[PDB]
Amino acid sequence: MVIPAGKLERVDPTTVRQEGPWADPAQAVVQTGPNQYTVYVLAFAFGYQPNPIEVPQGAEIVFKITSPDVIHGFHVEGTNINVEVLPGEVSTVRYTFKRPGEYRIICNQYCGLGHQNMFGTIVVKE
Numbered sequence: 001m002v003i004p005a006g007k008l009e010r011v012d013p014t015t016v017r018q019e020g021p022w023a024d025p026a027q028a029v030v031q032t033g034p035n036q037y038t039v040y041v042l043a044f045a046f047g048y049q050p051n052p053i054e055v056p057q058g059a060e061i062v063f064k065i066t067s068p069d070v071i072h073g074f075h076v077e078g079t080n081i082n083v084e085v086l087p088g089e090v091s092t093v094r095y096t097f098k099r100p101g102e103y104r105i106i107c108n109q110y111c112g113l114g115h116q117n118m119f120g121t122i123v124v125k126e
Contacts, residue, residue, distance in 0.1 A: 002088075010089045013068035015047075017042050022066060028052040043072045043118050051104070051121035057097040063122075066090040073109045074120025084110040088093035100124045 005021055010118045021027040022042040029052075032038045037060075044067055055061045065072045075081060078097060082111035084092040104121040106113070 025052040029054040041065040053122045071117040
């Protein structure tokens with residue numbers, strides 16, 4: 001089943017949050033392209049963890065969220081951004097802002113959850 005290739009990378013609860021980009025919050029924002037930063041987000045129901053999310057306006061942003069058995073996603077203003085992917089597979093969305101602004105709220109996530117998942121978290125830096 002878990003055998004990616006073309007697009008979208010599939011992960012596992014094995015050590016995806018213990019080792020790698022999701023392991024430490026320092027690996028959150030990491031430039032991998034000419035003007036595109038790779039953002040990582042993790043949120044599990046087993047304990048507690050920070051939300052070191054970033055999104056510099058003007059440059060491309062590739063958000064990467066992954067969880068063991070919990071949906072996260074995030075709905076940012078400006079556009080009808082619809083990002084929602086079940087746990088067990090890191091997602092990849094391309095959305096860049098034009099101005100600074102802090103937003104952390106979840107809603108209208110396809111199914112329209114509201115009593116399980118968590119509240120998104122994103123921060124823009126000038």
